[PDB]
Amino acid sequence: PSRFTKTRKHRGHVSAGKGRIGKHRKHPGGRGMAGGQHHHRINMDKYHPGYFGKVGMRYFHKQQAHFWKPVLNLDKLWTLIPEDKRDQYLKSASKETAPVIDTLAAGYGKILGKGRIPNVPVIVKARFVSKLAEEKIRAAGGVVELIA
Template structure:
């Protein structure tokens, strides 16, 4: 039978509001578990009707490229390290120009931050534009190695 008025408005004065024994509506068991509990079992019809895309995967994710970062060094750091490198034998001096392979130090790219005070012949995989300009201004040479 269809009710004209909602049960909750009629039964406010009663102790259990039409729920039978006072223990009946306690806990989450009354509503079949908390949250999405029972989505594969006793709430399956709800899932099918109201949230049909709940399970499964949709769409495509493009695999991300692995970005290789170059180890970099600034001209200012190289300028400070040159005396030590000459002593250790990592760099050599020929006709007033210091010869240095930056890869021996574990670097791959030379950046142009700072300034260089002496002519240097540097070898590296890459040079920034400003680094090349500053090296050539000081009378040196920037050699790119493939």
């Protein structure tokens, strides 16, 4: 709303908050990003280091689907199981009844071992896993079988 602005407050004051010397002008310092290696050099280096130059190797026709690999950490690993059945697998912490968790069906590409799943054996189906992620699943009695 315009009625809560400072424009309604500067009515009657000559310079409208811009100063009698400053004399608010069109573009006193340039338009856009003018003078980056120049009269705006200090602001660039202090706040945006790395802005100029090139750093790496190019990639022509990069499709962001060869790199789709959302990562799931072991700390959850159980939000995938519905909460209705989640309880009774914890009490039934036995093999031959181990739940099968397809991570790809949930939309994940890799499993990372952030830590501390419970001690219930569980079947985890995934495309990729980290080395530590599997060691915790195998220690808990479960196994990791790779899918594609």
